[PDB]
Write a protein that binds this DNA or RNA. Sequence first.
DNA 1: GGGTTTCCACTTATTCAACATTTTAG
DNA 2: CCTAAAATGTTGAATAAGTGGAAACC
Length: 295
Amino acid sequence: RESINPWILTGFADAEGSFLLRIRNNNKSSVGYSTELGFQITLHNKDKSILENIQSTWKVGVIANSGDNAVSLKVTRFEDLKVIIDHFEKYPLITQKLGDYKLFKQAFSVMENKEHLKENGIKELVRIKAKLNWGLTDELKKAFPENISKERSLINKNIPNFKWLAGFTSGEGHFRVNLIKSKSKLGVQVQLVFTITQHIKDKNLMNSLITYLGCGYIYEFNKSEFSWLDFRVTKFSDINDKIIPVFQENTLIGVKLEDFEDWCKVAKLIEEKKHLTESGLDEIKKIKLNMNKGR
DNA sequence: GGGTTTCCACTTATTCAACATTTTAG
DNA sequence: CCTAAAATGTTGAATAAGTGGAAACC
Ligand SMILES: [Ca+2]
Ligand SMILES: [Ca+2]
Ligand SMILES: [Ca+2]
Ligand code: NA
């Protein structure tokens, strides 16, 4: 029954939200197409209570299973989309997703004017959809023979505050205990790692985390044709003095919170040098077993 | 109406989270 | 030598993004 701070909500939407525009062949519509406009977040079942909390913050949206292991919050009821717009006007998005929101807003105006029931409005929705997310299907492009741009301006914005960061990290952030086989006396080095992962279309934002948080580095990764970035922090001093205090003051949501708290336990032990004792490493190992995929 | 809207079931691709090992720095 | 810090690479599923079907609203 708890609500979410609005900037945390926008950071979580930058991480996990998606805007939807359906343009559907419909034999019963006057113009031959019906439409649906919306916002949605799909998460693993274990984080259903986040969706319930967003739903009670906005008082809009419906929650439904999405397959066997996930669950969605979807807002497509047209009048309820005014809450979505009012929220993201007041607490605006930061990632390239802001561009998708701007297209969602253009689609909202077409629909608010009832133009989507006419030829000209459907054509404008098609032009808007061509720039949104994955674009037009081949079928829908062939149905609207017209030179239609798929290009948009890139978004370039700075992290607005640490609440946005707590929300974004609740989505994309990762805290772990990395056990490194070592030549140390004890034979296992404990490394705490904070990671944020993102596609390269938001390299600017990613690169800025180094300055925003005053620590870390960025790597690129390649998997066949796909590319993404990690921001990482591995220096214990930065973890303990910069990362941990941020998220104690700006509280994570979801089960990621419990992983952060467990991570902070191991930070305490390292600060006490108990990671260099057998009784310590044993406890660290137990804590790690119950984090992330092992929870 | 009956054209339009809204919801639920369910699918798809891949961008995330996750992870361990291997070097390097100091 | 002893630890800490950074780099090297994967992996596969939790995301993002999307479609089929139809009840029922206005
Ligand atoms: Ca994302
Ligand atoms: Ca995500
Ligand atoms: Ca490599
Ligand atoms: Na996530």
